[PDB]
Amino acid sequence: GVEKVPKYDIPTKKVDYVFIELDKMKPHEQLVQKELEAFIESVTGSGIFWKPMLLAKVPGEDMYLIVDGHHRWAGLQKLGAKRAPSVILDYFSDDVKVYTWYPAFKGDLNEVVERLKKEGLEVIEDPEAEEKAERGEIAFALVGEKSFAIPGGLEEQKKVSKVLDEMSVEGKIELIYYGLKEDAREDMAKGEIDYVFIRKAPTKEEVMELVKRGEVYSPKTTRHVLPFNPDKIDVKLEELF
Numbered sequence: 001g002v003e004k005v006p007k008y009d010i011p012t013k014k015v016d017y018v019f020i021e022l023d024k025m026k027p028h029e030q031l032v033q034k035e036l037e038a039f040i041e042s043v044t045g046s047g048i049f050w051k052p053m054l055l056a057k058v059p060g061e062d063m064y065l066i067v068d069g070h071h072r073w074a075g076l077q078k079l080g081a082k083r084a085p086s087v088i089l090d091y092f093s094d095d096v097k098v099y100t101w102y103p104a105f106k107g108d109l110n111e112v113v114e115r116l117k118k119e120g121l122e123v124i125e126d127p128e129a130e131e132k133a134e135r136g137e138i139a140f141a142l143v144g145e146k147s148f149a150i151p152g153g154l155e156e157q158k159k160v161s162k163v164l165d166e167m168s169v170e171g172k173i174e175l176i177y178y179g180l181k182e183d184a185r186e187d188m189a190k191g192e193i194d195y196v197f198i199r200k201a202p203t204k205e206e207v208m209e210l211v212k213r214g215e216v217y218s219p220k221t222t223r224h225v226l227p228f229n230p231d232k233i234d235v236k237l238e239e240l241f
Ligand SMILES: Nc1ncnc2c1ncn2[C@@H]1O[C@H](COP(=O)(O)O)[C@@H](O)[C@H]1O
Pocket: 035, 038, 039, 042, 043, 046, 048, 049, 050, 051, 068, 069, 070, 071, 072, 073
């Protein structure tokens, strides 16, 4: 899937990194196999690791939440590496926000209404669907020409994501992940998109809770807006083993 986000000015800041052991880092999303493979291919190609992990200390545990860096972490593990350069964030600062992504596609709601129904889901026509989704009462609202409620919670969200990640890689839909619901609705009006999937965004406390339960969200659940991007770093891959 293709990210499609606004032009946020987020400043680069020169924040030093520290090496943290990979087995002390906890993911909060399922991995995308394509992203993992691409990182492995890139890092082995140059032998430079230039983009630190962004981490948050798990309260009460000798562990860190991966805020940004799931595929770097997993890819380094698969290569046999032991650590990664990391920037530790003040995650519960008001300066850090968490939003979600809005999976939107161009296509027909037929190979998708039925192919979600094959994974085991319901799709009830409901004018209040988006309203219910945003209060966190259903798994997804599905909005385009009509409005549909997809009942459930996390297990159901993972099924909706699953279908789409497969069909994207398969190439029967064009899957864009919108940073903003309203941008999807613009591109929808223009005809470039047909439907959008709307769930309530997780809170920071929920992300931390999920991690402490040893659980993960589906891909593209969190969209963290951070007060800075760390400047690039000069770490050799050989330093990570
Ligand atoms: N040589 C490299 N060192 C560090 N990060 C990289 C390298 N090549 C690609 N990346 C990043 O690896 C990330 C893999 O996804 P994630 O770790 O989930 O953000 C992407 O954000 C890429 O920008």
